[PDB]
Amino acid sequence: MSRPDQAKVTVAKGDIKAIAAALDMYKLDNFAYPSTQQGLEALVKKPTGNPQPKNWNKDGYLKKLPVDPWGNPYQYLAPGTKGPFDLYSLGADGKEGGSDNDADIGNWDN
């Protein structure tokens, strides 16, 4: 997507796939996926329970990346409905919808 604001979307598309890979690395750190309650906290604060000797990362398990464009913070949620995780960023208008740059941009795995 090579247009103003969509150019912010195309960056985040690589960043979200980055997070999805690191969430798989938290999957390794706690030999399991986080829960949308305990594991969300365990994505922001060290996981309570038994994590393996692995360097835990906050912010939802991210790479060496800043936050998403438009000054929005990443929304990282753990398995909601059917899917092992839910992560996304809000669109340029601060809303989760379907659009180019006004869409919620994220990815997850189910």
Side-chain angles (χ1 to χ4, degrees):
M1 313 72 174
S2 306
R3 295 183 184 190
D5 279 270
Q6 309 186 333
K8 298 289 195 303
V9 175
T10 184
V11 175
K13 296 293 295 187
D15 302 314
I16 55 181
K17 208 61 177 177
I19 311 171
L23 198 287
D24 176 269
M25 294 179 170
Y26 181 88
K27 165 186 171 183
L28 181 62
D29 177 86
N30 209 209
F31 47 80
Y33 284 126
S35 58
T36 209
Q37 295 298 149
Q38 291 286 88
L40 191 167
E41 280 177 82
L43 257 51
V44 184
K45 87 187 184 187
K46 292 79 68 181
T48 192
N50 276 212
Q52 307 188 331
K54 198 286 186 296
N55 184 216
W56 176 89
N57 175 213
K58 77 179 185 174
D59 217 44
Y61 245 87
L62 179 64
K63 300 296 179 172
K64 69 289 293 297
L65 299 173
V67 78
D68 49 283
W70 315 293
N72 176 86
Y74 284 99
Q75 1 299 151
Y76 40 103
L77 305 177
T81 321
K82 302 300 178 179
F85 58 95
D86 281 93
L87 62 84
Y88 62 106
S89 310
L90 296 181
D93 194 73
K95 178 176 290 183
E96 33 61 84
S99 291
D100 293 271
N101 60 272
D102 296 268
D104 81 278
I105 55 180
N107 59 208
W108 53 72
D109 286 287
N110 176 29

